[PDB]
Amino acid sequence: DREKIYQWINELSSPETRENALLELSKKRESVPDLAPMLWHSFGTIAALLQEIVNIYPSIPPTLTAHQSNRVCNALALLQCVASHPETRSAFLAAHIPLFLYPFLHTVSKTRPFEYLRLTSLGVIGALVKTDEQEVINFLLTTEIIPLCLRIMESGSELSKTVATFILQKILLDDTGLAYICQTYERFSHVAMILGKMVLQLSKEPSARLLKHVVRCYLRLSDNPRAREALRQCLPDQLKDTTFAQVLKDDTTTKRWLAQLVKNLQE
Amino acid sequence: DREKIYQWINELSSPETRENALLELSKKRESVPDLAPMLWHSFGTIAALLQEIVNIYPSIPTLTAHQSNRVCNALALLQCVASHPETRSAFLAAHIPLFLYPFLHTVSKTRPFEYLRLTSLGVIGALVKTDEQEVINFLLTTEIIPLCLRIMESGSELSKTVATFILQKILLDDTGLAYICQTYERFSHVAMILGKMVLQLSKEPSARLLKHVVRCYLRLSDNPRAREALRQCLPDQLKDTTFAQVLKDTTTKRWLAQLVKNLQE
């Protein structure tokens, strides 16, 4: 067991064997809880995973194929293991490794290879914020991810919309993130304008998981005094009538969050 | 004065003001001796510098002279951080060299790319001037040696010189020498590239490059196994009179002679 794993890890550092090792290790990442520190502390291994990432950049005139996307997403999945493990997450963050994925998030092509690439990249950021440490939000605030999230929230695939809104929610929920987002009208209104478009979209094609995150974001913004005052005027009307009444029967948490939002705007 | 420096540092955070702050701060790095800790401990600043690097990656081959000058300003600032004793260790933990390695992989010979590569090399060169063990070990695990060899094989005279200097520093460390001699793939690749550079130096001399190449050979001869292989493969121009008139004026003479000495015994 642990022998065949160390052999695959060693085989990541040669182009002759890397592709097969990426496929095999990504399949076992859940059955190996110490896979992340094994990767991080193995000579040459992180550089080899990053080489898979950088080798995709020339495919960004967008020409990424399904095969290229699947291979690099296997490397991304191993990086996500490192992102989330308690023994490696801090060093991973301090090494700025998520920055290598931002060229992927900047793509707009709608082909299936690029959608899967962005979704998987977003998953790596999702793994970080799910650990709930304040170092993570600081990294996101100082790397300009917020515009990337907002644009994906605006026009991404339904799955990418959800992860990106989830990431913004985690930024908002942090006291420093909320203050950062509300620091200027320009920052606040970039967020509020995208949320309002998403509300309109949701009123025509339901998505309960996306609706919950959007409501949560509005509710958290209303904790900030100036955001609260602006939202009292710009809150989409579909959040105040019965547009979402039907679809919110199951979502008792979200139905409650919306009620709290509507009240907060009045106080 | 000092306040204008802190203002520019703060202006690196926003895309609206970053470009001008990069221009002004790069001009000020030599006269501001504590610039590196100022950059490092300001919120978001190192990240903004890395953003400038990562933003250019899709242009790595349509890079323009303007795009190159801009990122090279950021790179000059990153060199300040690499060279400062207060900040070098954190610089390594920040993995900043890894962001420069895509630049060293480019091959285009247009001036924007040549200046890009030379400036990136200066960052690494500044790192290795200190011989710290953790610096050598970071560069080894992040695969610096293939990138050095690639630049030594195909670069400009100035690029070949820094890349060989960097290889020389890795070789000077026992860990780097042992690593380079650990397999015959790696030793043969290093010896092959150095042999080609000797041929090219015999036809177009360059004292600075020749000194580093001899130093690399001398150091390889400290490894008892790089000795039997080097006895057979050492280029003929390092044994005869080829480089005498260029070595007229001593450090490289002694190194050459000691190399000959070392291979006999």
Curated annotation (Swiss-Prot), chain B:
Outcome following mutation: R208E: Loss of DNA binding
Gene (name only): CNOT9
Keywords, sorted A to Z: Acetylation, Activator, Cytoplasm, Nucleus, Repressor, RNA-mediated gene silencing, Transcription, Transcription regulation, Translation regulation
Gene Ontology MF term list: epidermal growth factor receptor binding; kinase binding; protein domain specific binding; protein homodimerization activity; transcription coactivator activity
Matches recorded under InterPro entries: ARM-like, ARM-type_fold, CNOT9
Tissue expression remark: Detected in spleen, thymus, prostate, testis, ovary and intestine.
Coiled coil regions in record: none
Entry's Gene Ontology cellular component terms: CCR4-NOT complex; CCR4-NOT core complex; cytosol; membrane; nucleus; P-body; protein-containing complex
Protein's GO biological process: cytokine-mediated signaling pathway; negative regulation of intracellular estrogen receptor signaling pathway; negative regulation of translation; nuclear-transcribed mRNA poly(A) tail shortening; positive regulation of epidermal growth factor receptor signaling pathway; positive regulation of peptidyl-serine phosphorylation; regulatory ncRNA-mediated gene silencing; sex differentiation
Similarity remark: Belongs to the CNOT9 family.
Gene3D superfamilies referenced in this protein's UniProt entry, alphabetically: Leucine-rich Repeat Variant
Cell compartment(s), UniProt: Nucleus; Cytoplasm, P-body
Summary of subunit composition and partner proteins: Homodimer. Component of the CCR4-NOT complex; distinct complexes seem to exist that differ in the participation of probably mutually exclusive catalytic subunits. Interacts with MYB, ATF2, RARA, RARB, RARG, RXRA, RXRB and RXRG. Identified in a complex with ATF2 bound to target DNA. Interacts with NANOS2. Directly interacts with ZNF335.
Disulphides: none
Name the UniProt record assigns to this protein: CCR4-NOT transcription complex subunit 9
Keyword check for Ligase: no
Function, in words: Component of the CCR4-NOT complex which is one of the major cellular mRNA deadenylases and is linked to various cellular processes including bulk mRNA degradation, miRNA-mediated repression, translational repression during translational initiation and general transcription regulation. Additional complex functions may be a consequence of its influence on mRNA expression. Involved in down-regulation of MYB- and JUN-dependent transcription. May play a role in cell differentiation.
